[PDB]
Ligand binder design. Structure first.
Ligand SMILES: Cc1cc(CN(C)C(=O)NC2CC2)no1
Ligand SMILES: Cc1cc(CN(C)C(=O)NC2CC2)no1
Lengths: 304, 304
C-alpha cells in the first residue's frame, strides 16, 4: 500500500551521461552506441543565444572543438552533424553500457523520468509530465542542458526528452532525441510564453483510482455523469476534455475497483465544484495529474 | 529554476539488489562485498508472522535453504547469521558492483531515497522522510521486503533503511542495516499503531526558502516571531518544536535569501493560522516537509 511519485530506476541512463564542452559552454550529452547526442546550444555563447544562426555558428566548429568526457576519460570525436535542435557527435568508441533503447516522441499528458545532470554527472531523478502546453515543470539549473527524460519497459529505455531551456516563467522546454522541440518553442533567448497549463483529466482520474485502491475513499460520491456533462465542468476548470479513448484506457482501473469511469468523473466533478474542504487524497491537497493510467497500474501491480 | 521531489540516482544501489528465497518466501536482499543483507522475515510463513520465534525458526535453516539470485545467476551461501532483525548471508563472491558505502542510522526528519524492488529487480525510485513517529510513507507491495533507503555523498552510498513491513494503517516500518527497527516496531503481524505523525518544521522552513529562491514569494509577510512564540503555534498544529540547532542549520538559506529564519517562522505561523486560501507553493496546496535544509541547498546548487 501507499502511492508515491515514482521515477524509473536511473542506472541504465546514468551509464549514458557524458560531459560535452564547446569553447566555454559545458553541458550534458547522451552516449548511445558511438553517438553522443546534445543540444545544439553547446555551440552558443550566452550572447549568441539572443539570435543564433546555428548553421553559421557550426561552420566555425570542427570535431576537435567538441570535448566529450565520459567519467574522467576523453572520447575522440570523428564526426558531427546537426539534426533539428540536437548535435550528433560520432565518437570512435561504442558506449559499452548502452542499454536497449528507442527514441519516442510522447504526447501531452505522458509522464517520464528525468535524470538531472551537471558536467555529465547525475544529480537526481524525478518524475515529470509533458504538460498540455508542451512545457514540463522540471528542476534544472545552468549546466543541466542535455539532461534526458525516459521511460523503461523492462530492459528497454525509451528516450523521450532532452532538456534545452527555461522560459522566463521558469517552466522548461526541450526536444525529442531527433531534436524536435515539444510545442512551439525555439532554442533562442527570446519572448516565449507558454499557453494554458490545463489539468490532464485522464491522469487525475487514474490517481483517484490509485487513491481508492490505497484506501483513500472519502471523495467517492453517490453521483454519475456523462462525458458531455463532465466536459462542460472540465472546460470551466481548465481540465483537458475527456474522450472515449481516455474512458477505454481507464477500463482496467474501473474493473479492479468496480467504480465505473463516469462515476469517478462525477466524484471529480464534485471535487472541482466543492474543493477538498481542507482534506487530502494520497497526501495531496490538490488533484495530482502526473500519473498516467499506465503508471497507476504499474505502481499498484509492482512491475520491474 | 523549479523545485522537484528528487531522489538520488539509483544506479549504485540497483547494482546491489538480489532475490532471496527461503522455502516459499521470496523478497529482496542487499549484496555488499560478500554479504547479502535481508529481513529475517525471509524465514517465516505468513502463519509464522503472527508470533514468530526467529531463533527457533532459524535452527531449521541451513546455508543451502537460502536461495540468493543476482540477475539470473545463483550465489553460493557459505554462512548465515542473524543480527537484530536482519540476516547476513555470507556468499562466496564479492559483489563486483559494490559501491563505496556506509551504514547510517538516521534521525526523524531526515530524508532518503527508496529503490522499490520485487524479486531482486528494481521497479522505481522515490524520496521519503523518516517521520517523527519513525514510520515512513512508502509505496510497497508484497515482495518489496528488503528494498533499501539510502543517501549518496558524491560516490559513497549511505544505507539508512531496509523495508520490513506495513502497519494496518498502510504506513511502513523498517530497520537500519544493523537490523534495528526505527521506532518501537517489531517484525510480527500484531497490533502496532503509529504515534502522532507531526510535521517536520525545519523541513517546511527549508522548503519555504526553496520557494522564495524559485520565485514563489506570495506568503512572505511583514511579521517576525521568536522561537518560543512560534513553538506555541507549532505545538497547536502538531508541528515539531523548532530548536536553535534547526535555526543554525537554516543559516545558509537565510543568508542566500536575506530572510531571517524567525521572519520565515512568522510567515509559516500565518500560513498555519490562515491556510493557503486556495493558493499553491511550488505546486503544492499543503506545506511540504520531506525536504531537509541540506536537500534544498543540494537541489538549488546542482550537487552531483
Ligand atoms: C536555469 C536553467 C538552465 C537550463 C538549461 N540551460 C539553458 C543551460 O543549462 N545553459 C548552460 C549550459 C549553458 N534550464 O534551466
Ligand atoms: C503490502 C506490503 C508488504 C510489505 C513488505 N512485506 C511484509 C512483504 O513484502 N512480504 C512478502 C515477502 C513476504 N510492505 O507493504
Amino acid at each position: 500500500s501507499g502511492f508515491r511519485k515514482m521515477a524509473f530506476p536511473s542506472g541504465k541512463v546514468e551509464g549514458c551521461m557524458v560531459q560535452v564542452t564547446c569553447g566555454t559552454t559545458t553541458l550534458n550529452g547522451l552516449w548511445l552506441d558511438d553517438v553522443v547526442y546534445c543540444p545544439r546550444h553547446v555551440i552558443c555563447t550566452s550572447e549568441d543565444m539572443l539570435n543564433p544562426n546555428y548553421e553559421d555558428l557550426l561552420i566555425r566548429k570542427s570535431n576537435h572543438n567538441f570535448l566529450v568526457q565520459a567519467g574522467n576519460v576523453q572520447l575522440r570525436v570523428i564526426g558531427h552533424s546537426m539534426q533539428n535542435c540536437v548535435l550528433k557527435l560520432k565518437v570512435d568508441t561504442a558506449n559499452p553500457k548502452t542499454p536497449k533503447y528507442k527514441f519516442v516522441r510522447i504526447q501531452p499528458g505522458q509522464t517520464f523520468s528525468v535524470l538531472a545532470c551537471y558536467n555529465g554527472s547525475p544529480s537526481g531523478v524525478y518524475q515529470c509530465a509533458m504538460r498540455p502546453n508542451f512545457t514540463i515543470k522540471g528542476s534544472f539549473l545552468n549546466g543541466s542542458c542535455g539532461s534526458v527524460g525516459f521511460n523503461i519497459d523492462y530492459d528497454c529505455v525509451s528516450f523521450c526528452y532532452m532538456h534545452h531551456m527555461e522560459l522566463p516563467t521558469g517552466v522548461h522546454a526541450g526536444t525529442d532525441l531527433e531534436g524536435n522541440f515539444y510545442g512551439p518553442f525555439v532554442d533562442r533567448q527570446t519572448a516565449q510564453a507558454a499557453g494554458t497549463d490545463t489539468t490532464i483529466t485522464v491522469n487525475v482520474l487514474a490517481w483517484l483510482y490509485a487513491a481508492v485502491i490505497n484506501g483513500d475513499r472519502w471523495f467517492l460520491n453517490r453521483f454519475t455523469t456523462t462525458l458531455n456533462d463532465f466536459n462542460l465542468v472540465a472546460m470551466k476548470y481548465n481540465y483537458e476534455p475527456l474522450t472515449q479513448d481516455h474512458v477505454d484506457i481507464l477500463g482496467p482501473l474501473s474493473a479492479q475497483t468496480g467504480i465505473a469511469v463516469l462515476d469517478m468523473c462525477a466524484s471529480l466533478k464534485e471535487l472541482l465544484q466543492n474543493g477538498m474542504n481542507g482534506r487530502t487524497i494520497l497526501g495531496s491537497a490538490l488533484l495530482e495529474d502526473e500519473f498516467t493510467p499506465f503508471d497507476v497500474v504499474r505502481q499498484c501491480s509492482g512491475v520491474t
